[PDB]
RNA sequence: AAGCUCGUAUCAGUUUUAUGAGGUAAAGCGAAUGAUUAGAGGUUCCGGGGUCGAAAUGACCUUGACCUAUUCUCAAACUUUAAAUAUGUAAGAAGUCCUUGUUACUUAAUUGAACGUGGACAUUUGAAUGAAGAGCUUUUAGUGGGCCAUUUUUGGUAAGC
RNA sequence: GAGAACAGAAAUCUCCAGUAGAACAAAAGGGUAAAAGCCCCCUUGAUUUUGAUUUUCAGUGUGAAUACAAACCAUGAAAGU
RNA sequence: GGUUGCGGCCAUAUCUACCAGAAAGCACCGUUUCCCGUCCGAUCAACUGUAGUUAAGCUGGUAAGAGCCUGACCGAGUAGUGUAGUGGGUGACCAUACGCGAAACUCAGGUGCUGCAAUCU
């Protein structure tokens, strides 16, 4: 009952969100988007591998919860449950409206059908992290999820640690310094901003300048 | 440094929470205004709870607020049934105390089966001089950290006079 | 049905300025306006009567009457294929006198000035505006300055 | 503050702040646009306010118009002044607030021309009179009461000064609604008593009623008027004594003013603290990071 | 049967055959509107002026 | 259609300069509101469970909410910021300056306000480009089913809708 | 948030913080802090006379509104409204 | 220079935490006969300027402070956009030509200026 994804795969429409003014709408098919050791730390990580987008489209929320699954079942019965961490980078906020169809035309606004993300071009869409040890098979998990995606999208090799904005040396000559802090499954950078009071009772292992 | 930062009580507020209005409110209206001279001051209940009886606006309580050292002999009448201890809580963070003792025979009044047996709540506001910078209407101030009034700073003047204990910790 | 009040569409126009609600601030009302005086319109949404009609807003008109609280503005609005004159009443609040003439009264004085220092002195004033002329021919040195070559860049990804 | 307190970055960048003269509770803004704002078709004519103020125990009054680049004092008059008139004593109570607005009156109405005419009342019994404009003259200089925050309350001192510059030539518009001896249940004012705060007999009787009562406290205050031989019945013939000396000259002496401005300027320098600049900010952190984080 | 709405197409070519034309300025607009109390008095204003110009000619 | 009054005259589906107005595109979310993923550190005399317990305003695990600093993602009916295109006004003789009459308005006031008399400075007289000229009046036809294209755009899976 | 007999999640009393996160009949959006919100005090301008103006526009009507004029009033110490 | 009263612009003025303030002025502060206001002379009114104090208000200074302001060929000539073609592509969309051109980011600087009147080592 399910409408084709094709009437659907084009931005023809404003964004239609859930809203007091909506307020109707179905539940999204994909709810989680950590998948794999997402408790991890920072250093556990450094390779980072993205799917991205190649075009100007809409990915239905269906076809996310089908391809986060695929993704995330290779990747764990090739390279372990906790070998990785997958994030699905793309949340479907907006809604598909249908005409359900003696009326004809006449007043056809129509009743929440489904979502779906609005999705532009070099938009990533997956991202996941490994030990460059894994490189390979975290590549073929996002080259079988690509099957379940309309339209063309590319997988891409980051030039920055894990999850982290900092590309690999530049991250480490700050680690590697004093600059870097755990924090659950990211880290707080040291900023020369601020109270010099706390900005030395965090980041202790500074202002020495040295490893 | 403490010359003019001394620890004066800026007013003493009793307060009988009757659960209704009628001859019970006025029968304990009646035992603040012979107990504070000042005529007493009620208030209306600012909902409808059904459970405790009352509709909005129903003149649910009497209370009556006392400056002038007046005040420090209805504290210590009340002190008296407290026994001078009082406890660690019973003291805002922001300085103030208060007590609560039912059956207002203890501190003083005789009985008159007339009027009954009547609660209060003693509540004492303290304060430093200079307080007016946040109560005056031109050039309306906030009195400085190291003259607000504080839990620590109140507790060592509350033990200091009237030799009274400040239990558990 | 459709909506088309005095205020319709009208949500951002009379919006207050960020930061910037509250009472008009006192010089607002020390202003003086005569006839003759060129004033923009504003709207200020604090202040509701004597306000000006949406259309209005933004634009700019004359003086024709100074009343207690209230000035009145005749606007040229165009109407079909020609224009009408519109006497608007509006408060203090939502005028301003109009820097749109201040520089042509500077260049005026500036004016009478350089003509008065011309005639005292030899002729030759030229006093019309110009407008911007292309460059003069001009040498341009290398000392410290050799000229660095650049190239196009190849591409890189970097995400 | 506690630390369930601390105001958010986001509560402060979004913070409006108020006029400065608000924040400093000192002018009420409501009240000032309906003051000075004039009617658009008289086009530059000031309005005038008759400003009074009460420190603790010093009366100002100011003669003020208004300048989008600010105030502007036509003339002003200090009650700390009215010694030169004769009046040592009680420079804040009624009688001394009646005197002062009198010689913003005078001084004014002398330096404006309208002096000789426009002389108000002269044989003051506490009647109810505005200065009414002469037959064929030039109208009364015209000014509005600047209460500023006080209080309206009838018989309260700020309607005191009002009296004095209405007494003094002024016209400043007024009901008598808010003068002692003023009744409340029937709307009439009795003169003799408002005649009697004119020259201060709340105060002349007060210190009677002390003289013979409990003479420790007519001791501490009034302490003053026993070092002069001022007991009370004289108290009335000093401010009228002083209300002809106000009338006689107002013409405003200064101080002899002792140490030229430039000398009060260098004594004051010394205690005021200057900033530091950025490379002395600078030297105290490098300084700190060695200090606090060096490990000792 | 349903029919066209509404559109101002071509509007803006007919309101320029003739187009648009400018407000046609004057010295000495007309007074309409102005506040009575400052117009009776201006009229005397003017009766004396004039009154004293054409006493230059006795 | 008839013309009429004038004609170096004023005129402009245009640029330039000066000065306004606007909340769209974008952008923003470790900024408000409203959505949304993940942990990490805090908080309970005080949300419910659980060991010890005679209880505790008792300790210790636990899970929820909340607070703190972070983190992935969003808005036609959200937003601090904020375009491009469009858009109001001004670019002089109906101008600028000076001298000082008129009034019943207005000012404490021959104060101001408006309208003037007398006087001073002409075509580089106040940007550009253009102009088979400019203004004005009357009277009347046909029309009041429209459709297409690029761009912006609503409904609809869509349509030669 | 922290404090007060019965008192409990919710009764009344006090202090601190509080840019409005409230309230302003009603839809929503503007607007508002010594107010435009809450409490009190005095009131009938929700009045008399006929014009001009803005939106809708044909620059008709109606509705609704704006700034004056000419009265008589209300309120406030007053400017004012 | 300081302080005051009245201000203009309305955070470079606000906020948090500390410290410093001579002189004068503000202020806190004493009193309740009088006018006047309260449940309470707390606020409000009156009286003293005497009995007391810089503790608070106030003013300034400190802070790899929060906020705020300013600048920058910092990002970025980027995003977006007006104009053009019988340009590319199944399309989605995208380059190109003549123009206009952000926001966030980042970094550096800054933390009230000032009008009238009176007053003060
Ligand atoms: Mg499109
Ligand atoms: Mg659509
Ligand atoms: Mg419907
Ligand atoms: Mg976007
Ligand atoms: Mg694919
Ligand atoms: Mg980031
Ligand atoms: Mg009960
Ligand atoms: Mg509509
Ligand atoms: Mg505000
Ligand atoms: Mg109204
Ligand atoms: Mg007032
Ligand atoms: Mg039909
Ligand atoms: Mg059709
Ligand atoms: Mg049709
Ligand atoms: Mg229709
Ligand atoms: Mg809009
Ligand atoms: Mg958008
Ligand atoms: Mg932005
Ligand atoms: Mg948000
Ligand atoms: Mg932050
Ligand atoms: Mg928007
Ligand atoms: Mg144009
Ligand atoms: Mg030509
Ligand atoms: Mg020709
Ligand atoms: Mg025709
Ligand atoms: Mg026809
Ligand atoms: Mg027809
Ligand atoms: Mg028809
Ligand atoms: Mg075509
Ligand atoms: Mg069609
Ligand atoms: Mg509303
Ligand atoms: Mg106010
Ligand atoms: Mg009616
Ligand atoms: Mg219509
Ligand atoms: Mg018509
Ligand atoms: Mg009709
Ligand atoms: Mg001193
Ligand atoms: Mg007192
Ligand atoms: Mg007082
Ligand atoms: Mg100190
Ligand atoms: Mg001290
Ligand atoms: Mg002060
Ligand atoms: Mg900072
Ligand atoms: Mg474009
Ligand atoms: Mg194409
Ligand atoms: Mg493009």
Same mark, same amino acid.
């Given at each position: 009952?399910?409408?084709?994804?094709?009437?659907?795969?084009?931005?023809?429409?404003?964004?239609?969100?859930?809203?007091?003014?909506?307020?109707?709408?179905?539940?999204?098919?994909?709810? &989680?988007?950590?998948?794999?050791?997402?408790?991890?730390?920072?250093?556990?990580?450094?390779?980072?591998?993205?799917?991205?987008?190649?075009?100007?489209?809409?990915?239905?929320?269906?076809?996310?919860?089908?391809?986060?699954?695929?993704?995330?079942?290779?990747?764990?019965?090739?390279?372990?449950?906790?070998?990785? !961490?997958?994030?699905?980078?793309? !949340?479907?906020? !907006?809604?598909?409206? &249908?005409?359900?169809?003696?009326?004809?035309?006449?007043?056809?606004?129509?009743?929440? !059908?489904?979502?779906?993300?609005?999705?532009? &071009?070099?938009?990533?869409?997956?991202?996941?992290?490994?030990?460059?040890?894994?490189?390979?098979?975290?590549?073929?998990?996002?080259?079988?999820?690509?099957?379940?995606?309309?339209?063309?999208?590319? &997988?891409?090799?980051?030039?920055?640690?894990?999850?982290?904005?900092?590309?690999?040396?530049?991250?480490?000559?700050?680690?590697?310094?004093?600059?870097?802090?755990?924090?659950?499954?990211?880290?707080?950078?040291?900023?020369?901003?601020?109270?010099?009071?706390?900005?030395?009772?965090?980041?202790?292992?500074?202002?020495?300048?040295?490893? | 440094?403490?010359?003019?930062?001394?620890?004066?009580?800026?007013?003493?507020?009793?307060?009988?929470?009757?659960?209704?209005?009628?001859?019970?409110?006025?029968?304990?209206?009646?035992?603040?205004?012979?107990?504070?001279?000042?005529?007493?001051?009620?208030?209306?209940?600012? =909902?409808?709870?059904?459970?405790?009886?009352?509709?909005?606006?129903?003149?649910?309580?009497?209370?009556?607020?006392?400056?002038?050292?007046?005040?420090?002999?209805?504290?210590?009448?009340?002190?008296?049934?407290?026994? =001078?201890?009082?406890?660690?809580?019973?003291?805002?963070?922001?300085?103030?105390?208060?007590?609560?003792?039912?059956?207002?025979?203890?501190?003083?009044?005789? =009985?008159?089966?007339?009027?009954?047996?009547?609660?209060?709540?003693?509540?004492?506001?303290?304060?430093?001089?200079?307080?007016?910078?946040?109560?005056?209407?031109?050039?309306?101030?906030?009195?400085?950290?190291?003259?607000?009034?504080?839990?620590?700073?109140?507790?060592?003047?509350?033990?200091?006079? =009237?030799?009274?204990?400040?239990?558990?910790? | 049905?459709?909506?088309?009040?005095?205020?319709?569409?009208?949500?951002?126009?009379?919006?207050?300025?960020?930061?910037?609600?509250?009472?008009?601030?006192?010089?607002?009302?020390?202003?003086?306006?005569?006839?003759?005086?060129?004033?923009?319109?504003?709207?200020?949404?604090?202040?509701?009567?004597?306000?000006?009609?949406?259309?209005?807003?933004?634009? #700019?008109?004359?003086?024709?009457?100074?009343?207690?609280?209230?000035?009145?503005?005749?606007?040229?609005?165009?109407?079909?294929?020609?224009?009408?004159?519109?006497?608007?009443?509006?408060?203090?609040?939502?005028?301003?006198?109009?820097?749109?003439?201040?520089?042509?009264?500077?260049?005026?004085?500036?004016?009478?000035?350089?003509?008065?220092?011309?005639?005292?002195?030899?002729?030759?004033?030229?006093?019309?505006?110009?407008?911007?002329?292309?460059?003069?021919?001009?040498?341009?040195?290398?000392?410290?300055?050799?000229?660095? #070559?650049?190239?196009?860049?190849?591409?890189?990804?970097?995400? | 503050?506690?630390?369930?307190?601390?105001?958010?970055?986001?509560?402060?960048?979004?913070?409006?702040?108020?006029?400065?003269?608000?924040?400093?509770?000192?002018?009420?803004?409501?009240?000032?646009?309906?003051?000075?704002?004039?009617?658009?078709?008289?086009?530059?004519?000031?309005?005038?306010?008759?400003?009074?103020?009460?420190?603790?125990?010093?009366?100002?009054?100011?003669?003020?118009?208004?300048?989008?680049?600010?105030?502007?004092?036509?003339?002003?008059?200090?009650?700390?002044?009215?010694?030169?008139?004769?009046?040592?004593?009680?420079?804040?109570?009624?009688?001394?607030?009646?005197?002062?607005?009198?010689?913003?009156?005078?001084?004014?109405?002398?330096?404006?021309?309208?002096?000789?005419?426009?002389?108000?009342?002269?044989?003051?019994?506490?009647?109810?009179?505005?200065?009414?404009?002469?037959?064929?003259?030039?109208?009364?200089?015209?000014?509005?009461?600047?209460?500023?925050?006080?209080?309206?309350?009838?018989?309260?001192?700020?309607?005191?000064?009002?009296?004095?510059?209405?007494?003094?030539?002024?016209?400043?518009?007024?009901?008598?609604?808010?003068?002692?001896?003023?009744?409340?249940?029937?709307?009439?004012?009795?003169?003799?008593?408002?005649?009697?705060?004119?020259?201060?007999?709340?105060?002349?009787?007060?210190?009677?009623?002390?003289?013979?009562?409990?003479?420790?406290?007519?001791?501490?205050?009034?302490?003053?008027?026993?070092?002069?031989?001022?007991?009370?019945?004289?108290?009335?013939?000093?401010?009228?004594?002083?209300?002809?000396?106000?009338?006689?000259?107002?013409?405003?002496?200064?101080?002899?003013?002792?140490?030229?401005?430039?000398?009060?300027?260098?004594?004051?320098?010394?205690?005021?603290?200057?900033?530091?600049?950025?490379?002395?900010?600078?030297?105290?952190?490098?300084?700190?990071?060695?200090?606090?984080?060096?490990?000792? | 049967?349903?029919?066209?709405?509404?559109?101002?197409?071509?509007?803006?070519?007919?309101?320029?055959?003739?187009?648009?034309?400018?407000?046609?300025?004057?010295?000495?607009?007309?007074?309409?509107?102005?506040?009575?109390?400052?117009?009776?008095?201006?009229?005397?204003?003017?009766?004396?002026?004039?009154?004293?110009?054409?006493?230059?000619?006795?």
């Amino acid at each position: 009952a399910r409408r084709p994804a094709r009437c659907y795969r084009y931005q023809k429409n404003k964004p239609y969100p859930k809203s007091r003014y909506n307020r109707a709408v179905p539940d999204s098919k994909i709810r &989680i988007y950590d998948l794999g050791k997402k408790k991890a730390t920072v250093d556990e990580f450094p390779l980072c591998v993205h799917l991205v987008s190649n075009e100007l489209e809409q990915l239905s929320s269906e076809a996310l919860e089908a391809a986060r699954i695929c993704a995330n079942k290779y990747m764990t019965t090739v390279s372990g449950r906790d070998a990785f !961490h997958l994030r699905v980078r793309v !949340h479907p906020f !907006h809604v598909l409206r &249908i005409n359900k169809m003696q009326q004809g035309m006449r007043g056809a606004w129509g009743k929440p !059908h489904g979502l779906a993300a609005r999705v532009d &071009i070099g938009q990533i869409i997956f991202s996941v992290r490994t030990k460059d040890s894994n490189k390979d098979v975290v590549v073929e998990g996002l080259r079988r999820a690509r099957y379940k995606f309309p339209g063309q999208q590319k &997988i891409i090799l980051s030039k920055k640690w894990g999850f982290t904005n900092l590309d690999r040396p530049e991250y480490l000559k700050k680690r590697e310094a004093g600059e870097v802090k755990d924090d659950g499954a990211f880290v707080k950078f040291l900023s020369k901003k601020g109270s010099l009071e706390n900005n030395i009772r965090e980041f202790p292992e500074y202002f020495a300048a040295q490893a | 440094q403490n010359p003019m930062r001394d620890l004066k009580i800026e007013k003493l507020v009793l307060n009988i929470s009757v659960g209704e209005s009628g001859d019970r409110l006025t029968r304990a209206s009646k035992v603040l205004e012979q107990l504070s001279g000042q005529t007493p001051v009620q208030s209306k209940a600012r =909902y409808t709870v059904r459970t405790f009886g009352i509709r909005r606006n129903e003149k649910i309580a009497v209370h009556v607020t006392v400056r002038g050292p007046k005040a420090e002999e209805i504290l210590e009448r009340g002190l008296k049934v407290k026994e =001078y201890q009082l406890r660690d809580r019973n003291f805002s963070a922001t300085g103030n105390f208060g007590f609560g003792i039912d059956e207002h025979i203890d501190l003083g009044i005789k =009985y008159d089966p007339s009027i009954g047996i009547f609660g209060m709540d003693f509540y004492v506001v303290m304060n430093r001089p200079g307080a007016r910078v946040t109560r005056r209407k031109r050039c309306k101030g906030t009195v400085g950290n190291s003259h607000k009034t504080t839990k620590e700073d109140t507790v060592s003047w509350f033990k200091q006079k =009237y030799d009274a204990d400040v239990l558990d910790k | 049905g459709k909506s088309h009040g005095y205020r319709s569409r009208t949500r951002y126009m009379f919006q207050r300025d960020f930061r910037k609600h509250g009472a008009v601030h006192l010089s607002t009302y020390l202003k003086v306006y005569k006839v003759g005086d060129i004033v923009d319109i504003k709207a200020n949404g604090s202040i509701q009567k004597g306000m000006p009609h949406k259309f209005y807003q933004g634009k #700019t008109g004359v003086v024709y009457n100074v009343t207690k609280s209230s000035v009145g503005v005749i606007i040229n609005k165009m109407v079909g294929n020609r224009y009408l004159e519109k006497r608007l009443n509006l408060r203090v609040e939502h005028i301003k006198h109009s820097k749109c003439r201040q520089e042509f009264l500077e260049r005026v004085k500036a004016n009478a000035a350089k003509r008065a220092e011309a005639k005292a002195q030899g002729v030759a004033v030229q006093l019309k505006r110009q407008p911007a002329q292309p460059r003069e021919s001009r040498i341009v040195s290398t000392e410290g300055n050799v000229p660095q #070559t650049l190239a196009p860049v190849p591409y890189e990804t970097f995400i | 503050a506690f630390q369930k307190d601390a105001k958010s970055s986001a509560y402060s960048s979004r913070f409006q702040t108020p006029f400065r003269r608000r924040r400093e509770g000192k002018t009420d803004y409501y009240q000032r646009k309906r003051l000075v704002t004039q009617h658009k078709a008289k086009y530059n004519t000031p309005k005038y306010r008759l400003v009074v103020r009460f420190t603790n125990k010093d009366i100002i009054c100011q003669i003020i118009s208004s300048t989008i680049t600010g105030d502007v004092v036509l003339a002003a008059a200090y009650s700390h002044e009215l010694p030169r008139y004769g009046i040592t004593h009680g420079l804040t109570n009624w009688a001394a607030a009646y005197a002062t607005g009198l010689l913003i009156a005078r001084r004014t109405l002398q330096k404006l021309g309208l002096d000789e005419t426009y002389k108000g009342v002269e044989e003051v019994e506490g009647e109810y009179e505005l200065t009414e404009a002469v037959e064929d003259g030039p109208r009364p200089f015209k000014v509005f009461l600047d209460i500023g925050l006080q209080r309206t309350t009838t018989g309260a001192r700020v309607f005191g000064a009002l009296k004095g510059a209405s007494d003094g030539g002024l016209y400043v518009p007024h009901s008598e609604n808010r003068f002692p001896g003023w009744d409340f249940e029937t709307e009439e004012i009795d003169p003799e008593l408002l005649r009697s705060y004119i020259f201060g007999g709340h105060v002349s009787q007060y210190m009677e009623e002390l003289a013979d009562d409990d003479e420790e406290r007519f001791s501490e205050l009034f302490k003053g008027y026993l070092a002069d031989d001022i007991d009370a019945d004289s108290l009335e013939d000093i401010y009228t004594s002083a209300h002809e000396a106000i009338r006689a000259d107002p013409a405003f002496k200064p101080t002899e003013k002792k140490f030229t401005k430039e000398q009060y300027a260098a004594e004051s320098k010394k205690y005021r603290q200057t900033k530091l600049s950025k490379e002395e900010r600078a030297a105290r952190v490098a300084a700190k990071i060695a200090a606090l984080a060096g490990q000792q | 049967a349903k029919s066209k709405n509404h559109t101002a197409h071509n509007q803006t070519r007919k309101a320029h055959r003739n187009g648009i034309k400018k407000p046609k300025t004057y010295k000495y607009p007309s007074l309409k509107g102005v506040d009575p109390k400052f117009r009776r008095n201006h009229k005397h204003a003017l009766h004396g002026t004039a009154k004293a110009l054409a006493a230059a000619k006795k």
